[PDB]
A paper describes a structure:
To understand the structural basis underlying the filament formation, we solved the 3D structure of [name] [name] filaments at 9.6 Å resolution by cryo-electron microscopy (cryoEM) and iterative helical real space refinement (IHRSR). The cryoEM map shows a three-stranded helical assembly with a central pore that is about 18 Å in diameter. Neighboring subunits in each strand are related by an azimuthal rotation angle (ΔΦ) of 53.6° and an axial rise (Δz) of 16.8 Å along the helical axis.Video 1. Apparent helical stripes observed in multiple filaments of different orientations suggest that the actual helical structure is left-handed. We therefore built a model of [name] oligomer by directly fitting the crystal structure of individual [name] [name] into the cryoEM density map.Video 2. Overall the [name] [name] filament adopts a densely packed structure containing three intertwined helical strands. In the structural model of the filament, each [name] [name] monomer directly interacts with four nearby monomers: two from the same strand and the other two respectively from two adjacent strands. The intra-strand interface makes contacts between adjacent CARDs within the same strand while the inter-strand interface holds the three strands together. At the inter-strand interface, the positive and negative charges are alternately distributed at two opposite ends of each [name] subunit, indicating that the inter-strand interaction is mainly electrostatic. The cryoEM model predicts that the intra-strand interface is stabilized mainly by hydrophobic interaction or hydrogen bonds among residues F16, W56, Y30, D53 and L48.
Recognition of viral RNAs by RLRs leads to the activation of mitochondrial antiviral signaling protein ([name]; also known as [name], [name] and [name]). Activated [name] triggers rapid production of type I interferons and proinflammatory cytokines. It consists of an N-terminal [name] domain, a proline-rich region (PRR) preceding a poorly structured middle segment, and a monotopic transmembrane (TM) domain at the very C-terminus. The N-terminal [name] domain of [name] is necessary and sufficient for forming active [name] aggregates.
Residue numbers in the entry:
A (entry chain A), B (entry chain A), C (entry chain A), D (entry chain A): 370 to 462
């Protein structure tokens, strides 16, 4: 699990611009691995810094909690970002 | 039962906009197939994301539990959404 | 008995707003035709959905059990809703 | 901790021109040791006086709050100022 998650997080970082269509506020409802604290912090970050800058923090926070990749794949599908979801599933395998 | 429920769930998904008048909070009292856990989660989803986004999760959760279509038909009738109820009964047959 | 009960239940449904003063929690002590299960369910419904919405379920549940109209007339009198009690007796005759 | 922070703050002051590429508005999202009050004041300072002059106040404010050097190193990395981040880590050790 660790190897696979680390690899996926590394891939998201190197390919960040693939993920800049992701809207932090829209994706949060599908990420139950994030705590209430995480969600409030990310909302504030978004308010202060904008969505693009917050995406980095979203990914950084996701990778700390447990069971993030499955939910991230789900969340991407929930937002109709199927190619992105498939690209994540592919790296996580 | 499985074939009929899967078909009804597929129909609800393809015809989602038919069901966007459904109010999640109003319909919950008629859905005893949902666990207390399901109801609390759906309430939270509604709080965080709004009714429309929660409807998707409502339908997704309903289809997992047992005996959901009958109660969903009942719940639609309970909320005076008779045409919608009939449309569901029609697909479930 | 069936014809008379069905007629009374139909009348309660068509004239629901006449009965919205009825307090579910206050009326339960006078309804021994309801099972312990019925009472617990109705309490929960009341907790989740409020008295008005629960009244519909109260009437729906009453009509299934046996010997409900007599006790319902009694229960209305027990709650000092004499005109309502008389209106029910009148339809049940 | 005090000795190390004081030394780092002294180094930032003596080597201020190394840090004049730092953009106050860009760095604030990575400085959770700053209070909401601190952030509003620094924004105003920036509006009235420009980024260079505000950097002095940024550093002066950072050094008062607790746990500032770690976050400052983080914030420099967040803004892709890796050599600067490393230079701070080096002095703080």
């Amino acid at each position: 699990m660790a190897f696979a998650e680390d690899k996926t997080y590394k891939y998201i970082c190197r390919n960040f611009s693939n993920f800049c269509n992701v809207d932090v506020v829209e994706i949060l409802p599908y990420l139950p691995c994030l705590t209430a604290r995480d969600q409030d912090r990310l909302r504030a970050t978004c308010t202060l810094s904008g969505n693009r800058d917050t995406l980095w923090h979203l990914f950084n926070t996701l990778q700390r909690r447990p069971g993030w990749v499955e939910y991230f794949i789900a969340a991407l599908r929930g937002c109709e970002l199927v190619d992105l979801a498939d690209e994540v599933a592919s790296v996580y395998q």
